[PDB]
Structures are given as C-alpha cells and as structure tokens.
C-alpha cells in the first residue's frame, strides 16, 4: 500500500555523512564488495554520484531525500533488497569511470539512478510466478512484469515532494533521462538479455556496431545493465558464494509457495533439490553470465576484469561439482 517516504532524520544524516578515506581508492575497483560497510551504503552512493557526475549534478537535499526514500522502498527479502541495489549501482560506477567519455552526463546520472532503483519494491517473486498465478501485476504488465513495476515505482519516488532530482533539467533532457532510465530498468529482464546479447554479438562480429547509432547505444546500455545486475558473479569467490545463498533462499521460498498451489517448482526453486545447485550455477554461468561479460569486454575493453572474475567463479563452481570444495562459512 503506497510509496514510502524517508524521515527528516534519515536524509539529514546522509547529508552529514563523510566517507572514510581508505575507501576512496577501494570503491574505484570492479571487485569492491560493499558487504562489510552496511552503515555507509547510502553514503557510498552519494560519493559515486558526486565523483561520476560532479557535486553540482543534483541539489544535495533532494538527492539525499531521494536515496533514503529509495532505501525504504526496498523490501526485507533475502536477495532483491537494498544491498543488491547499491551493489548494482557500484558496478555501474566502475563501468562508467572506466569508460567515462563514451557516455553523456545525462546517461551517467540516469544510469546510476536506474541501477539504484532497478529492483524497487521487489517482493521475492519472479515474473514466472506472477504470470503463472495471474497476480494483478501480470495483467497490468504482460511482459517484463516486475521491471515495468520497478520503473513505475521509480517515477513515484521522483514525484514525492522534494525528491525530484531531475527538475533542473531542460524539458527535452528530462524526457531523455526518464527514457534512459525506463530502457535501462526494462533491460534487467533476463528474458530480453538473450536476444540483446545475440544482436550485439552479431553487430560486433560484422563490424556494424556504431555507438553513435541510438538503437545500438540502447543495446550496449542494456548489456551494461545485465552485467551490473549479475555482478555478484564477478566478486571474490567467498563473496560470490555468500550472495548465492541469498539468491537461493529467495528462490526456495518461491518454490514453497508453488507447492501449496499444486505445482511442483523447477529444481532451482526446490529447497529439497539443493544437491543440484552447483550444476545449476554452472548452467547459469554457461548460458548467461559468461557470454554477457564476454560480449561486454569486446565492446568495452576496460570491463575485462568483470569477465576474468566471472571465469574464476565458474572454475570454483566446477571445483564444487568435482567434490574439491574446502571449508565455507555462511
Ligand atoms: N541473478 C542470478 C540468478 C542466478 Cl540463478 N544465479 C546468479 N548468480 N545470479
Ligand atoms: Ni530485477
Ligand atoms: Ni537486480
């Protein structure tokens, strides 16, 4: 029921927040893991917007209201939560810092906000679920159901009194940024990823890819959104392994719901099929993450460390399968 608004207490605090010095250099790296710094997450987001877009990109008060209200519109679900939002935004920051001039000031502001907002009000249910059991959302949004919902929630937050960080933009630029943000959130539907990646791969291989071609730009941005959304697979193995427990915790709760409604879930959502997870992650890396980061690296060479990390994690899942796992804490 409705869109949640942060307290004066919340946003004034973030305004007064300052980032410990040692973290400045860390935040720049692809592999950086926000995990051990929970109190600082909203502040790390300020810092990234200020570094990428400049301290004058947004009136700070409205930026701070926007971020903390964004936080309050994430749910307490094991995975599609506030921590994932900031993780995704950080990956985008590393991509943009490493490819800064390829992207307009409008694209950078739009994309960091899109990443932070891309799973707003996620309920711990997949599009598969909502469409299977005809949730009202599936009727409103026949395809990319939750993603269209996340964009809707983003616009609602902006429309809160004192939250509209895009107000100072020309009328034309405003429409462009909302369009940037809409396309970027929609692209985080993995259903679209398969065709997008295949197109981009084709365009790269034939040499037709042209970044001054809007339709090409939209697709590159789309794959960037995929890379950022899946970035848990690009971290150090223990970090990757730990996040995966959260991914599966959320899936298995969905599977539990399906069982009550007389449908056996897919194995991935079946908590009594845990022995199949390492092989499922192997399949997910083979069909999704590997090709994603491969293509992204061809298009944006400086993103190559995301790909090497993901190949290292693939190998770690293969070790698990062979029975060579050593001690893991969770
Ligand atoms: N977003 C996801 C989904 C699955 Cl099955 N696995 C990973 N690593 N990330
Ligand atoms: Ni999503
Ligand atoms: Ni996501």
- Structural domains of the chain sorted by starting position, each given as residue range(s) with its CATH number in brackets: 1-330 (1.10.1300.10)
CA angle 91, 92, 98 (to 5 degrees): 95
Q: What is the best residue among 225, 230, 313 to mutate for testing ligand 1's pocket, by most ligand atoms within 8 Å of CB?
A: 230
Cβ(247) – ligand 1 distance below 6 Å: yes
| Token pair belonging to 273 | 């099929």
Q: How far apart are CA 187 and CA 196, in angstroms?
A: 9
CA distance 304 to 25: 19
**Which of 131, 6, 19 is CA-nearest to residue 70?**
6
For residues 106 and 123, give the distance between their C-alpha atoms in angstroms, rounded to a whole number: 30
Distances (CA, A) of 92 to 236, 293, 302: 18, 13, 13
Residue length, the chain?
Answer: 330
Is the beta carbon of 232 within 6 A of some atom in ligand 1? yes
* Nearest protein CA to atom 3 of ligand 1, as residue: 247
Is the C-beta atom of 284 inside 6 A of ligand 1? Answer: yes
In units of Å, what resolution does this entry have? 1.8
Nearest ligand to residue 148 Cα = 2
Contact 303/297 with Cβ under 8 angstroms? yes
Two tokens, residue 152: 């809707």
How far apart CA 85 and CA 41 sit, in angstroms, is 10
Write out the residues surrounding ion ligand 3, Cβ under 5 A.
119, 229
C-alpha span between 293 and 310 (Å, rounded)? 8
Q: Solving technique for this entry? A: X-ray
Pick out the residues of the known binding site for a divalent metal cation.
84, 118-119, 229
Among the listed residues 217, 196, 225, 181, the one whose alpha carbon sits nearest the alpha carbon of residue 89? 225
Q: How far apart are CA 254 and CA 188, in angstroms?
A: 20
Asked whether 18 and 8 are in contact (CB, 8 A), the reply is no
Residue nearest to atom 9 of ligand 1 (CA): 230
Minimum CA distance residue for ligand 1 atom 2 = 230
Task: Answer yes or no: are the C-beta atoms of 70 and 92 closer than 8 Å.
Answer: no
Nearest ligand 1 atom, CA 232:
8
- Name residues whose C-beta falls within 8 Å of residue 247's C-beta, 6 or more positions apart in sequence: 79, 232
Q: Which two tokens stand for residue 11?
A: 């946003």
Q: What's the burial of 128, exposed, middle or buried (CB within 10 Å: 0-12/13-18/19+)?
A: middle
State which ligand 1 atom lies nearest to the alpha carbon of 233: 8
Q: Which of 191, 190, 208 is nearest to 199 (CA)?
A: 208
By the 8 A CB rule, do 17 and 46 touch?
yes
Which ligand is closest in space to the CA of residue 234?
1
Let me know if 80 is a catalytic residue.
Answer: yes
Q: Which two tokens stand for residue 255?
A: 């599977």
Catalytic pick from 31, 50, 80, 122?
80
Binding residues for 3',5'-cyclic AMP: 80, 281
């Amino acid at each position: 029921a409705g869109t949640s608004i942060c307290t004066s207490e919340e946003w004034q605090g973030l305004m007064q927040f300052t980032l410990p010095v040692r973290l400045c250099k860390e935040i720049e790296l692809f592999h950086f893991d926000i995990g051990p710094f929970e109190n600082m997450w909203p502040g790390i987001f300020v810092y990234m917007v200020h570094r990428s877009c400049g301290t004058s990109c947004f009136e700070l008060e409205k930026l701070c209201r926007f971020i903390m209200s964004v936080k309050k519109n994430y749910r307490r679900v094991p995975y599609h939560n506030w921590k994932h939002a900031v993780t995704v935004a950080h990956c985008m920051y590393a991509i943009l810092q490493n490819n800064h001039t390829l992207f307009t000031d409008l694209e950078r502001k739009g994309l960091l906000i899109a990443c932070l907002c891309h799973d707003l009000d996620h309920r711990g249910f997949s599009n598969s679920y909502l469409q299977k059991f005809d949730h009202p959302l599936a009727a409103l949004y026949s395809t990319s159901t939750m993603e269209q919902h996340h964009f809707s929630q983003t616009v609602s937050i902006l429309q809160l009194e004192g939250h509209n960080i895009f107000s100072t933009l020309s009328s034309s630029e405003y429409e462009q940024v909302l369009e940037i943000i809409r396309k970027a959130i929609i692209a985080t539907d993995l259903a679209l990823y398969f065709g997008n990646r295949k197109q981009l791969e084709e365009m790269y291989q034939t040499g037709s890819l042209n970044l001054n071609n809007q339709s090409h730009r939209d697709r590159v941005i789309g794959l960037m959104m995929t890379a950022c959304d899946l970035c848990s697979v690009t971290k150090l193995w223990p970090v990757t392994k730990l996040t995966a427990n959260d991914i599966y915790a959320e899936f298995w709760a969905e599977g539990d719901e399906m069982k009550k409604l007389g449908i056996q879930p897919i194995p991935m959502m079946d908590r009594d099929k845990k022995d199949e997870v390492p092989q499922g992650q192997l399949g997910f890396y083979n069909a999704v993450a590997i090709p994603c980061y491969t293509t992204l690296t061809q298009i944006l060479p400086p993103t190559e460390p995301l790909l090497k990390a993901c190949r290292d994690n693939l190998s770690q899942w293969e070790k698990v399968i062979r029975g060579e796992e050593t001690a893991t804490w969770i």
